[PDB]
Amino acid sequence: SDRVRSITLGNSTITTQECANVVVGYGRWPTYLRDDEATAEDQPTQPDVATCRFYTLDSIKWEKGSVGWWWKFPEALSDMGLFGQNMQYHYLGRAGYTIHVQCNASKFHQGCLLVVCVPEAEMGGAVVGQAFSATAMANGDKAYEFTSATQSDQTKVQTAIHNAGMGVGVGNLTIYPHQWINLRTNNSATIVMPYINSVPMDNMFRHYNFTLMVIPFVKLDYADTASTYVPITVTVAPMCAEYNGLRLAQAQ
Amino acid sequence: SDRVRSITLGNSTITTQECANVVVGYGRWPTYLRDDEATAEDQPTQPDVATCRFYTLDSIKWEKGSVGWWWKFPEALSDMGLFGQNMQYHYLGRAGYTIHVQCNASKFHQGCLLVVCVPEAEMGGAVVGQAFSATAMANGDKAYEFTSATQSDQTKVQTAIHNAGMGVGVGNLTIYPHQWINLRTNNSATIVMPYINSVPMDNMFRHYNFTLMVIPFVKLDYADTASTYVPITVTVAPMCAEYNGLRLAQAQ
Amino acid sequence: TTDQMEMFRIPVTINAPLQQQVFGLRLQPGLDSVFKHTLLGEILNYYAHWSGSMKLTFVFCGSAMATGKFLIAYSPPGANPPKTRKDAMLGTHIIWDIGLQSSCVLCVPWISQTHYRLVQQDEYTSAGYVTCWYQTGMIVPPGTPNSSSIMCFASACNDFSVRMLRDTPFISQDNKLQ
Amino acid sequence: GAQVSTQKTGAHETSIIHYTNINYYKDAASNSANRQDFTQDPSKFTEPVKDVMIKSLPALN
Amino acid sequence: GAQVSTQKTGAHETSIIHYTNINYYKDAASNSANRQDFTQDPSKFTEPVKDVMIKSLPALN
Amino acid sequence: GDVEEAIERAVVHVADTMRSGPSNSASVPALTAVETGHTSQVTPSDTMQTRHVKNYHSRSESTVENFLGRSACVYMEEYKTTDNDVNKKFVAWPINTKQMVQMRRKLEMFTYLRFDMEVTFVITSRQDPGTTLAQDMPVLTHQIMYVPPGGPIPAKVDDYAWQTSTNPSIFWTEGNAPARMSIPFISIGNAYSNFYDGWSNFDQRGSYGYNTLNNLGHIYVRHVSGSSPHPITSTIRVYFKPKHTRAWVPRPPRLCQYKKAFSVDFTPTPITDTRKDINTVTTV
Amino acid sequence: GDVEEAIERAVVHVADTMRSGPSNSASVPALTAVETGHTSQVTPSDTMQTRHVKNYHSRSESTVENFLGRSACVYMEEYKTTDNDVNKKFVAWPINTKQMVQMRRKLEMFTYLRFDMEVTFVITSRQDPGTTLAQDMPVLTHQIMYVPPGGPIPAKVDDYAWQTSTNPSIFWTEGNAPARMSIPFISIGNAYSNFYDGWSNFDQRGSYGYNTLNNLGHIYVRHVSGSSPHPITSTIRVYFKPKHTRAWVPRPPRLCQYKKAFSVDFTPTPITDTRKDINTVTTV
Ligand SMILES: Cc1cc(CCCCCCCOc2ccc(C3=NCCO3)cc2)on1
Ligand SMILES: Cc1cc(CCCCCCCOc2ccc(C3=NCCO3)cc2)on1
Ligand SMILES: Cc1cc(CCCCCCCOc2ccc(C3=NCCO3)cc2)on1
Ligand SMILES: Cc1cc(CCCCCCCOc2ccc(C3=NCCO3)cc2)on1
Ligand SMILES: *C(=O)CCCCCCCCCCCCC
Ligand SMILES: *C(=O)CCCCCCCCCCCCC
């Protein structure tokens, strides 16, 4: 079958026995910066296998009452091996990614997740006019969660799920690269995101190029099974990573 | 003249207005490992410009009574940017180096240093039979010093200069790649060391491939000048660095 | 161990804590008790040197209704073994998904400073560790057992060879037989 | 397949001075020594300088 | 009728490495060992399956 | 005619490692069905990125000819030059390969074997301790005789059977290179059997096991006319080195220690040694 | 086919001296810059008037193959034929080249070495002195066994390990030519290391120095069945002769006397000996 899938980057391989297809950016495969699109003049580093490989973030639990989660990139990978090291020593960076979201249940469980990558997912504050800090939206590979109720805590982002933290209709997030994990048919989702920005390269700490959101559109449900929660794991591999402007490492 | 010299590796350039020649290993220029000389099967990383560039260690003072110093490699570079990072994340590494020892004085100063690179500079303990720790011979870019008197401290290496810590005649160290900095004619020394070992690659923490020794054969002397000490600075650039066996970083 | 056959069964269970470790073993095919008495280990014990890659095949033996994803990794030697899945995932690994194909092969490559390692392995000749972790978890529908077993097979690859014939430490006698 | 080669010169002026050898074992380790290879290069050690230096011309500048 | 064949490589890079043998006895049992036959096939043991299985394609169905 | 070209200028190596880059396909090499009784032919390039490696390693030292082709002690016994007990003066050994543990384990890794055999004897003598040891005994000569099944067996050092008009014998004198000779493949079958799951009688009774197929005869050894004033004890050690070997149907190596010379008999031994838990990977 | 022409009819000599006359030029050979790390290629004709000399001298005796290619004693130990102490009856030696000073200094003139090895054994026996020495012991036979790292080690002269079904052994009888055999280049590395500036542990702890790379195994030797009424002491001497040699990165010769077998350890020793003043050139 086509359900079978194998992906190898560097020293890591991912396999899936029940998948859908592989969504590719806006039909654009990741690629290194061309000479006719560059501004920064220094010779870049392209660590290759050391950085372009699969990194598995901490797992999370999908429970009957879960509402949704988000991770901002590249921040989510800032501590991952040499990818994180290269981010720290360089002023500029550029990369695409293979995102593989894993979630297995059973033929007797039901549920459905939207797995989307939102470019420039600029978010609103819990209380309009009140500024929040970076910590309200990203911190290493920590998963952030949406809420059903509207957020009151001004130190937070407006987490009410139906507006996806952006002031738009959550059911319209489908115009962004996405895949669905319907427990009845899938067991994982794979999206290849190319580099998307208004400038050729950018600083990797200061700018979150895109945000991965995993949202349960149909709640997790099951009968008298001994299994309770269903884990969700995110594994991602940078692709065609290149960096410019080497100097001392950024403390954080 | 030929005294003029310019060397560019990565984002760094070294220039000298009064040099001798450039000594090259045993006539062997650094080079990447060939397919017919390899054992480790994984695709290696060759960070290129990020690692193959000039790193300047802490400087030292050459005083009238100085006796000599040594630095062990690659240990001396274990904290230097991405070179150090790559050393930590990989089981195996391989590299050659361009060593540039700097020392300027004046037409009225006199003195002469031997700048040598000793492959496998295995050393004896201060007290025969007594084991010492790694700290007695290397620790980051810290310069270690020889002594005139024979060493009594058992936690140390036998530092008596005339036997160079190896039980041989110090005046015979010339069979190893070397250059002399005679204040009267030079102002620096440049030695390009290729990778020399009995195995194709090796662990970079556990094995000190070679030791750089700077020894005053003719003492620093001068008259009524206001300058007192003459600084000695070591700048070195890894060449053709490649690593294999990626895994978690070694704590130290 | 009460029952000898239990040695071949790697336990796997439902509701395991996230990122939990399933097992960990050190790569000394001729010396470590896990490998020394297998076909591969027995052959190695008639030699003093070895070189090459190895195949570790894992087969899931639970019911057709159980599901799960596991991360199996190989860590080249270094001062410290991986203590967490986060540590393990930085090395050579494969993510195993359970489905019709019950078995998965982790192929541990020959990554060494020397061309050959010693059968009577030492620190200089260290080969590393192989560890396994829950990637997601073993999920089960109603009416199926709560735990299951995984089995591990081992064999050499086509780049594997041994050198230096020697007697094996595994057989001896105090008297002539009879 | 016997190999025939020249001997190292003796007290008398040099043709009668060649010896013959035949290998009897299956491993090259069993063979006699290579007493007669005189290839030699002292320059890796006597002159490892990047830029070649002709004797007649001065060394510096 | 002497047989001439190649030796197993030694510490030095390889022509001078061949040895010669002559049998002196009337029975083949008297001959030296066959130290140099390297024919080898692991498939009777590693893959005795009736239907051949290519690695790329799945094993079942 | 004069010279012959049996040169093996093209010898076999171990497989090279092919360079391998990234992949994203439906083709999945790492997933298989162990159930088929098939061992996977996977290589590192199938599951990770590899560099190209020209591998020169060779499996020369692990051919069966090489593994079995070293002389191994298969038996040893003593015989005195002078003693009151007739049987203490000569050795009578029923040829077999099951009494010395090392050789036995090696041969037993295969079910059937076919080979020629090189036999070397190491004989040493020592003067027995006693109150009066002064004597001047000339060099000793030994006779080793092979008696095929059914031939007359010697009952004492001086009996007629030692004439060897037809049985093969070796006369050897001390101080010289150890005695040696070759024996061809002498089985009545097409291969020697290391195991025999069966009986001697059609009834399914009688002897059970490989011992029922062992009828290679005996080896008898004595001093020639070596009676000395004070006793001297000689010890003979016999070495076997198979050559021109062929082996069939390989078996798991013997795990339990051997208990009997003529039977598979053993005492249950655990699979392997234990460690504290399934994650223990340290030494201390 | 029959004969082969590997004749070296064109052998290398030392450089000739060219005739050289007066000069008056701007070209100055005798002035250089030692600072470049360059050794001057000057010859007498550069600084004085020379006659022509056809030089036939040759550097044949100073090739590394020749310098290292002589058998040197690397070890010696005694083992008794009979003694109350089990360990006094056999030798167990961890193969190495660091215990005998002469060979050690020669090998240590190079950092890396690659060669095949010819091993010759010289074994001699003597009767121990005592009150009663009259005995008549037959010729002695010795067994020398090589145990690769990890193989079973003998705990006494009569133990099973001496069966050598797989380890290589030599059985040798006194009165004969010394035993000898060749061993190929057996390192797990590409060359043997005489020095190793490093540790065994990745931690930069554990063993330090070349000893961490020494794992060549052991040599075990015993008398075969040589128990004598009165003790006899045998002494074995082992000689190494490297052949088919290659050497890399030469080092200054060892100046200080050696203190330990497994470490570079030394006591500071002066550069050389002294004379009364910088102009003293006479002897008395
Ligand atoms: C050694 C050894 C191993 C065995 C098994 C015997 C295998 C021998 C194979 C065939 C050898 O030739 C024969 C000689 C006589 C007999 C015989 N069978 C019934 C009694 O004598 C059969 C085969 O037991 N001891
Ligand atoms: C049974 C069986 C078969 C084997 C191998 C054993 C067969 C060994 C061949 C038998 C060799 O017997 C000898 C024959 C003759 C002599 C001898 N001839 C000259 C004097 O001594 C010695 C041994 O494994 N199991
Ligand atoms: C003699 C001698 C010289 C030395 C240095 C050893 C150099 C040997 C080079 C390689 C020989 O083959 C090896 C066998 C085993 C080991 C080994 N290393 C860790 C412990 O065992 C490494 C190489 O110490 N003793
Ligand atoms: C370490 C190191 C390496 C060296 C040279 C030492 C290597 C010497 C080769 C090892 C030789 O060991 C023997 C092998 C077998 C036998 C033996 N075989 C038949 C009986 O004795 C004896 C020596 O320098 N430093
Ligand atoms: C090479 O063998 C070609 C010519 C043959 C010469 C005859 C050999 C002389 C007798 C020695 C045989 C060696 C057997 C070990
Ligand atoms: C084969 O014999 C053809 C060439 C003859 C070579 C001469 C043999 C050298 C002397 C050994 C004779 C062997 C007699 C046992």
Swiss-Prot record, chains A, B:
Q: Which domain of life is it from?
A: Viruses
Parts forming coiled coils: none
Q: Residue span of the signal peptide, if any?
A: none
Where found? Answer: Virion; Host cytoplasm
Q: What does this protein do?
A: Forms an icosahedral capsid of pseudo T=3 symmetry with capsid proteins VP2 and VP3. The capsid is 300 Angstroms in diameter, composed of 60 copies of each capsid protein and enclosing the viral positive strand RNA genome.
Record note on quaternary structure: Interacts with capsid protein VP1 and capsid protein VP3 in the mature capsid.
Name this protein carries in UniProt: Capsid protein VP2
Q: Output the lineage of the source organism.
A: Viruses, Riboviria, Orthornavirae, Pisuviricota, Pisoniviricetes
From Swiss-Prot, chain C:
Source taxon at top rank: Viruses
Localization of this protein: Virion; Host cytoplasm
Q: How does it assemble?
A: Interacts with capsid protein VP0 and capsid protein VP1 to form heterotrimeric protomers. Five protomers subsequently associate to form pentamers which serve as building blocks for the capsid. Interacts with capsid protein VP4 in the mature capsid. Interacts with protein 2C; this interaction may be important for virion morphogenesis.
Q: What does this protein do, in the record's words?
A: Forms an icosahedral capsid of pseudo T=3 symmetry with capsid proteins VP2 and VP3. The capsid is 300 Angstroms in diameter, composed of 60 copies of each capsid protein and enclosing the viral positive strand RNA genome.
What is the name attached to this protein's record? Capsid protein VP3
| Species name | Coxsackievirus A9 (strain Griggs)
Curated annotation (Swiss-Prot), chains D, E:
Consult the record and explain the modifications the protein receives after translation. Myristoylation is required during RNA encapsidation and formation of the mature virus particle.
Question: Which domain of life does this protein belong to?
Answer: Viruses
Lipid-conjugated positions (N-myristoyl glycine): 1
Compartments annotated for it: namely: Virion
The record describes its quaternary structure and partners as:
Interacts with capsid protein VP1 and capsid protein VP3.
Chain's role: Lies on the inner surface of the capsid shell. After binding to the host receptor, the capsid undergoes conformational changes. Capsid protein VP4 is released, Capsid protein VP1 N-terminus is externalized, and together, they shape a pore in the host membrane through which the viral genome is translocated into the host cell cytoplasm.
- This protein's name: Capsid protein VP4
